Amino acid sequence: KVFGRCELAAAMKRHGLDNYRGYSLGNWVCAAKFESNFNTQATNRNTDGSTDYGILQINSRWWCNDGRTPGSRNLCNIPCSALLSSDITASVNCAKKIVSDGNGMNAWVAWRNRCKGTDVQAWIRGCRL
């Protein structure tokens, strides 16, 4: 599913991301925008052989099982395919563990390079929330 901007902002707010670990909703909407362009079915293979999945590009090295990432963990206890659903629950639930892990939203490289320190409020501006 390709979410609209305000559509994803509502879904992410419903699922408790607004100010989750201190990160305002705009940060999560931005991170989705640059990780996946809001497409739940986004996948990207990494040179190390892991794959990133879903709206927040969650990596199989740590967080999910795809059966093809040797040596990896599955800390969200889900098949990576669950991260591709039109329903964002598995992605958000897994992202809450990721952002709790020590480095906050720096775990999402696109967030650090493109969202951090910017006017992230713009991403939710105008949305009924």
Long-range Cβ contacts of 93-102 (<8 Å, 24+ apart) = 93/15, 94/58, 94/63, 94/64, 95/17, 95/28, 95/56, 95/58, 96/16, 96/17, 96/20, 96/21, 97/63, 98/56, 98/58, 98/63, 99/20, 99/21, 99/23, 100/21
48 is in an annotated binding site: no
Nearer to Cl ion (CB atom), residue 25 or residue 90: 25
Shortest distance (Å) from residue 129 CB to Pt ion: 12
Annotate each residue in 12-51 with x if it binds Pt ion (CB under 5 A) or - if it does not, as one string: ---x------------------------------------
Is 127 in a helix, a strand, or coil? Answer: coil
Size of the site for Cl ion (CB under 5 A): 8
Interface with Na ion in residues 64-93 (CB under 5 A): 65, 69, 72, 74
User: Is 35 a residue of the active site?
Assistant: yes
Binding residues for Na ion (CB under 5 A): 60, 65, 69, 72, 74
| Residues in contact with Pt ion by the rule CB under 5 A | 15
